[PDB]
Amino acid sequence: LSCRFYQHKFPEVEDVVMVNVRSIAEMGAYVSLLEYNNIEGMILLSELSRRRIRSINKLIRIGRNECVVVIRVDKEKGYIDLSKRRVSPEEAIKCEDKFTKSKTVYSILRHVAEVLEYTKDEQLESLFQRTAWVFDDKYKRPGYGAYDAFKHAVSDPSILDSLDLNEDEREVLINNINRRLTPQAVKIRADIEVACYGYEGIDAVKEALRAGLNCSTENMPIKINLIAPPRYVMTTTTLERTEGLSVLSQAMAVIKEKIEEKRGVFNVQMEPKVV
Amino acid sequence: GSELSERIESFVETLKRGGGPRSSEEMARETLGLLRQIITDHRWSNAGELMELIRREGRRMTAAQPSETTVGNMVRRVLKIIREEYGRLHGHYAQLQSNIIEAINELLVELEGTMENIAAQALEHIHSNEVIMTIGFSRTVEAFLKEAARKRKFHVIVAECAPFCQGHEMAVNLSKAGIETTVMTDAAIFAVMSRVNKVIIGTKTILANGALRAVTGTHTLALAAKHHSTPLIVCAPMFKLSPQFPNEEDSFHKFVAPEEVLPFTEGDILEKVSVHCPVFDYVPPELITLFISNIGGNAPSYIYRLMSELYHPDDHVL
Amino acid sequence: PPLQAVLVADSFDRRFFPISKDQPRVLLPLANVALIDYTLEFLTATGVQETFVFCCWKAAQIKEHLLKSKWCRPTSLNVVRIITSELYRSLGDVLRDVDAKALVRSDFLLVYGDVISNINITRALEEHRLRRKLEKNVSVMTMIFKESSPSHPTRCHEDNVVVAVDSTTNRVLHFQKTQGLRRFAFPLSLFQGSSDGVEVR
Amino acid sequence: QVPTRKDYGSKVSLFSHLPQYSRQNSLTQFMSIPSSVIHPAMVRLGLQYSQGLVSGSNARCIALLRALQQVIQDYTTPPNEELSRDLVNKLKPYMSFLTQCRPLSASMHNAIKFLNKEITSVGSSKREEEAKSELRAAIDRYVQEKIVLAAQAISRFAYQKISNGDVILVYGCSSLVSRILQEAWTEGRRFRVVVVDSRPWLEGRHTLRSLVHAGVPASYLLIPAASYVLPEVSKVLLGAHALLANGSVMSRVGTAQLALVARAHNVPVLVCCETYKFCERVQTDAFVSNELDDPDDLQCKRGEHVALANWQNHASLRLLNLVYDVTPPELVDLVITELGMIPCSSVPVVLRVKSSD
Amino acid sequence: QVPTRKDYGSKVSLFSHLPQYSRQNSLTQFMSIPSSVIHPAMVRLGLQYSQGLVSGSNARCIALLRALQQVIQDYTTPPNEELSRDLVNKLKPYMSFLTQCRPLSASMHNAIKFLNKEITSVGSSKREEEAKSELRAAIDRYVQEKIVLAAQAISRFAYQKISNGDVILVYGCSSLVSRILQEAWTEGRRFRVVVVDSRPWLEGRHTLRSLVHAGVPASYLLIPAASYVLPEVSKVLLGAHALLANGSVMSRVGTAQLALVARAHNVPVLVCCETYKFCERVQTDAFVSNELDDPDDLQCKRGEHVALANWQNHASLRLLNLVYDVTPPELVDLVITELGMIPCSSVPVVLRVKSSD
Amino acid sequence: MEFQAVVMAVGLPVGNKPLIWYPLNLLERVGFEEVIVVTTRDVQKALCAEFKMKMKPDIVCIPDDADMGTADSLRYIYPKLKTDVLVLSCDLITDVALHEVVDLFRAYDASLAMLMRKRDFIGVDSTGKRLLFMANEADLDEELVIKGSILQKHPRIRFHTGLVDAHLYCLKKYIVDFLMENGSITSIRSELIPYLVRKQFSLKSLDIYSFIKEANTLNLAPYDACWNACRGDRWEDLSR
C-alpha cells in the first residue's frame, strides 16, 4: 500500500529529488525515487562526481539516501536521468528538509487512511488529492504548502473544515495531525546561585525571587525552587524553547540585578538548557 | 575562534593521552570534521596561506601522537586537495571554498564505504575449507571474514596479542557467526605455519615503500609466511596509507607501559631489569604479497603510484 | 555533577632538607618537569573540572611557576584556583579552610602536590557514588592503593602501609604503618563487626 | 583398575588423537587413599606432574628417578617369580598412569628405556637386596653424571664461546641455560641477557630471577618484541628439551619461531642438550606427537572483559595452547653437549656412540 | 527460461563453490530449436565453447566478438526504448548463458567490459543502423589492433631478444607463441624449441604442428622431463592467458610449476600477453577463481586396465583437473607487450594508461 | 602402605545410627584395609565390646587409659605405626569425599593437611590452600600478633572466623617422632597445629595445608550439634 508524495507523477527538470540507490550497473546507478511512488531512475556514471572516478561503487553506497538533480526526463520512454554533481550542499539540505516534511505528511495521511481502513490505492490517492495536493496546488508549493497547512490546522482547525472528504475522514485527519505534528512541549531548566551575606539576607533573597517570578511572561511561568541553601533551580515548562531560553536568561539577569542592587552575589550554576 | 581553539586543544589532548576514539574510521571522520570546521570559519586570500595554516596545525597534530599517522596523512590528502583545486582554478574565494567543501563531502562519502567495498570484494579471495590466520583485532578483517563466511565454510586461526589479548574479543565475535575460530598464543605461529593456507591480516599504517607498521608479532608472522610461501593479504583502507619512510624519521614504534608485560607485583628484580613493550612492529614490503583496499587489490610494488594519486612530494615533511 | 579536587602543594613534613629550603619539593624536576605539572596532568587525565591548589611555604614561587604553565591558560578544560595563605600548616587546616570557604559540592578528590600517577578512577568514582546512593551517605572516603610487592624499591620501610580490609565489599577496618615494628597487632572487634570476610593486605 | 580421564572441552580437529586434559579435575577421585595398584611415590609424582608444579624437563627426570628409587626401595619379590620380568611388568602400569597424568617428556622416555635395560640385565643368581642396591646405585650414578657432569661440561664448552660485551638472548625456563649464564658471569665474562617470554606459562620470570640474584644485567621482553630486539642481539641461547633423529629441536613452543626470526636477523642460535635427552623417534611438525595443556589457561584479566570465560557455550570456538614444537635442522647451528660442540646433523651419530655401539 | 546445468560427479571440498560440468550433456536439451531467449549466434558460440572446440583465449575472444557482431547485425530497437541500456539488459542473459556453458576467460571479460563501455557511450541523436554500423566498425577496429598489431609488436620485441643458437622452451597452445616462433624462424634466427606438454588436453601438439610446417627443429617433451631438459634450456617462452593486478600470470596449469623449475635451473621465463588480457581482479592461488574441466577426461587406455572408469561408484574418490593457475610475481621476469618489455610489477601501471587515464 | 588411619575416642554412639560407623564407613568405602581405632576410657571403659560388634572388614581396637588426651594417644601407638598418620574422631559426619585433602597432602609434599568447614581465627594464603596462622580467642593475652616475615613472604592473608575443625588430619612420621621426643604436648589439636604453624615461619621448611569445604559440617561432643546429626544423617547416608 503506497502512493506518490505530490500531484505530479514525474519530477521536472533541474528538480532535486531524494533517492536511494538500489543497484549498480556499468551505465550508472539504478535508484528509486522515494517521493514519486518508487519509480526507477538512474544516476549517471559521468555525473557521480566532479573528479575522475575509478569505480562507481566508491561513492554510490547502495542503501543510502541522497539528493540528486534531474538532468533529463522522458515520460514516454520512462527514462529519468539524475545527477549528484549538480546539487549543492544548501540545495541538499533544502531537499532533505522538504523530503522530511513530505514524509511526515505521507505518514500522517497513511495513518488517517489506516484509521479509515481504505485498502484500495485509488481511494487513498483520492484522500491524497483531497487533503494535501489541493493545498499544494493552491499555495503553488509542493511539500511546503501541505506541511504549512497541516501546521496551521494543528493550531486552528478551520483549514481542515474546508476539505469535503467525509464527516469522519476530516476528524481522523485532524486527530492524526494533532497527534503527529503538534508536539509543543519543552522544559528549559536552569540553576542559579543567588544569595546575600548582609543585613537583610533572606529578605533580599525573597525580594530577588519575587522580582524573578514577576518577570515571567504569559504561558511561560518561571518556577523557582530551593534545590539547595546557596543554590536555586529556575525551571520553565513551555513551548518555543528558543524563546524560553531567552526568557529564562532575562529572568536570571533580572534576578542578578536585583541581587547586586541589594549587595549580594549572584552566580550562574547552569545556563538555560532544555530538560 | 574560541570553539575552534578548544576543539583543536581537546583533539590534541585526546590524541596525546589515549586512543580517542576507538575505531580509526571515526577518528578519520572527526579529522575531516575538524578540518572542515577550520576551513569554514577562517579567512585567507591565497591558497598558500591555507596551506601554511594546515601545515602548522598538522605539525601539532603529529606532535601530539606520532604513532597515529591517520591524522597526518589525512591532513596531507586535504593539502593535496587544496593543491589540485588551486591548480585547476589557477590555469576564487567562494567558488573555490565550495569546491573544497564538496570535495571533503565526497571524500567522506568515500570514507563511509571502505569497509563495505572490502567486504564486497572479500568473496574473490576466500575459498571453502580454508585455514585463515589473523593477528590482533580490527573491524576491517572482521567484516572481511564475516562476509566471506556468508557463503563459504572455512576456518580462522585468531592469534591473540601478548602485551594485551585483543584477539579474544575478535575470536568471540567471529565465533558468534560460526566460522570455527581457533585461539592460540603468539609463540605457536611457526608451530602452526605448516598448516596455514592463507594469512589475512590488517595493519595500522602503510608506509611508502610498501612496508607497514602494525600490531606487534606480525613481522614474525610475515617471516613465517615467507618461509612457508603462503600469500599475505592486507585488508587496509585508503587512509592508513602514509608517505613516512621507515628509517627516515625517528619515533617509529609506540612504547607503552611495561605493566602489561611484567606486572608491578614481581618483586625486587624490577629495579635491575629493563622491560620494553613495543606495541607496533615493522614489516618490510618483500614479505607482503597483496594489499586489499576499497578500490581493489594492489601489489606492494604499486603503493608509490597511490602516493602519486593521493600525496604531493612537497608535503612529505608537513 | 562536576568533579572537584583539592591539591595540597605544600608537604608539611620536614624531610627534603635542605633541598626544600631554596625551592619547594613540589617544584623539583623528576625529568625536567616539576611534580606540580605531573599531578595536574594526572588530574586532567582523570577528568576533573576545577582544582584548588593550596600552598603555604614559598607560595609566590609556586604561583609564578604554575601561572606560566598549560593549566592556567583560558583554553584549558580544567581550571585552577590558587589559594594563598600563610596561616595553615597542616592538611587538616587545608580541609577546614575548604569547609569554611564551602568550595566543594559532592565527591571531591584529595591529592598531594607531589603525587605521580596515571590512574583513571572513574570506576572507583562510580563505585563510591553507588555506595553513597545505596547506604545513604554512609561511605565517606574511598582510599586508593596499588598492587605492589613488599620487596619493591618503590615502597620503603618508612612508608610501608599494612591494612586489614573486607574481601567482598572492600571496606577498610584497620590501617597502620610499619615505622619500626617487627610484629604487627590487629584488633579483635573487626571480626565481630564483620563475620562475612576479612583479609590483611 | 585405573580409569580413563575425560577429555576436557572441544578439541581441535587436527589434534583429535592427542589428549587434552584439565587441571581442575584429578584422576584420584576414584582411587584408593592407601595407594595399592599405583605406588604412593608414583601417585605423588603424578599429582605434582598434573598440577604443573614440576615443569622443567631435567626437574621432571630428577623427580621421576627419585620416585623410581622410592619404588625400588619399597619393592618386594613374589614367590616363584624373577625380578627381571616382574619389575618390567609392574613398572608399565606406573608409566601408563604417569602418561595419563601428563604426556611424558623425552627425557622421561629415555629414563624409562635405560631403567628397563638396567633391570633386564639383572642376573637370576643375584639376591633381592643386592640387586636392589645395585639398581639404586646405578640410578644414582646415572643421574649424577648425566645431570651435573653433563651440565658442568656444557657450561665449560659454552664459557669458551661467549665473549665479552656481547648480548645473549634466552627463552623459557631451563636450569642448564641459567647455569651456563651464572657460571659465565661468575667466571669473568661481562655481558647482558635479553629474556624472551611467552603466554600462558610465564616461566621465564623464573629464570629472570636467576639472572637477577646472580648480578647479571637482564632485559625482559616477550615473543612479539623478539623481532624488535634481535637486530641488537648477537647470540641466541636456547634450552633444548629433546633432539630427534633428523636434527630437530623439540622444546618450548616459541623456539623454532624464535630461531626463524633469529636467522632472519642474522643471529646464530645455540641450543644446549644433554645426551640422555636425545631421540630415536623423529617427527617433522608439532601435530603428530605433542602435549595439550589446559584450554582455560589462555584467558586473562584485562579489566572486566574476560572474553574466553564461557568459551564452551560457543560451539564454533576452539581453544589450544601448544607446549612442544620442532625446528627444521637448517635453522639451528650449534648443539652443545658434554662431548663438545656438534651440529644438528650428527645428533643421531652420538646416539650410535651412546647405545653401546 | 534458461535453466542451470547440473554439476557432474562429486566435487572437491576445496572447489565446492566452483562449478564442474561435463561435455556429454548440454543445456540445449531444455531449450527451443528456434533460439529466441538466446541468440542463434550466441548459442552456437556456447555450443562450440562447451564441447572444447575453441580452447585458445585469443580464438575464444575472436569468436565471441564475431558472435557479438552477428548479434548486433540482427538487432532491432523496440519502441520508446533507448539502445544504450536495452542492449546491456539483453546482453546479460547471453553472457550468463555463456558462463553456464563454460567459465569465461579474462579476455572475454575484458571484451564484455569494452563492449559495455562502447554501447553505453552511444548518442541518442544517432539512428539505429548508423549506431549499429558504428558499433560493428568499433568492434572490428578494436579486434584488429589489439590482436594483430599487438601480435606484430610483441613478435618484433621478441625478435630483438632471441639470439642465434639458443634453446627456447614453450608450453601449451597459443597463437601468439607460434606466431612469435614462426616470425623468428623466418626473419633469420636459427634455434630449436622444446615443446613441453601436459595431460589431458594434449593441445601443444597443435603448436608442434606449426613448428614442423614452419621448418623449425622441435623436441616434444612432457612436464616431468621438464626438469631434465632445463639444464640445457637457456630461455623459457610462455603464453599468458591473464595477468592480474599484483603481477600474477593466470595461465594453463603447467606455468607456475614450470616457472619454478626454470628459476631453480637459472632459466629466465618470458610470458607474452596482450594488453586487453589484463585484470583489475586479483587472486593469489588457483582455488578462489578457476575453471573445472571434465572429471572423466583423466582416464586413458593403458592396455585393458582403465582404473578411472567406474570412479563414481567409489564414495571416497575425487577426480579433479584444473584449467588455470596463477604464478607468484617473483618467479616471472618478462612481460612482452606491444609497449615493450616490462616486469610483472608494472602490469597495473599500463592498465592506468589504458583505462583512459 | 601410605597411610594408617587412626580414629580417636575422647569424651558415644547416640543418634539414629552408631556414631563410630560413619567414620568407619568413610574409611572402608575408599581403601583402608587396615583400620586402627582407639577406645574411650574417661567416661566408661566398655566401648570396645560395643565397637567390636560391627561388620567391617578389619578393625584394630586397643584399650586406653582414663586421664589421657589426643597427644597421649598419638604417643601410645608410636611403636605400632610405620607410615603417615591420618587422624579421625567419633563425632565426624563428613559427606565431603576426603580424596582432595590427600591430594593437597601429596601434591605439595606437605607435612600436615587438615580440613575445615563453615571462635578460631584462621588466616590462610590467598590461593586458599596453605594456612599461615590460626588462633583461638581463649589462650591469647592480646588480640592477635603477626610477624613481619609471614607478611613479607605472603603479602595478603585471608582470615576466616566461622570455621569448625573436622578433625581430619594427615601427619608425617617426623612430626610424631618429635611428638614422641617432646612429651609436654597433651592436646594434639592445640599443639600440632600451633607449634607447626609457628615453626613454618622460619628455603627448606615444612608445609601446612588446609581445605575449606562448603558442602556439610562435622558434629560436636556437646548437645549443641546433636540435633543436626539425625537431620544430616537422614538425607546423606542414603547414598552412602
Ligand SMILES: O=C(COc1ccc(Cl)cc1)N[C@H]1CC[C@H](NC(=O)COc2ccc(Cl)cc2)CC1
Ligand atoms: O580443519 C581444519 C582446521 O584447520 C586448523 C585449525 C586449527 C589449527 Cl591450530 C590448525 C589448523 N582445516 C582443514 C581445511 C581443509 C583441508 N583439506 C581437505 O579437507 C581436503 O584436502 C584436499 C583435497 C584436494 C585438494 Cl586439491 C586440496 C586439499 C584439511 C584441513
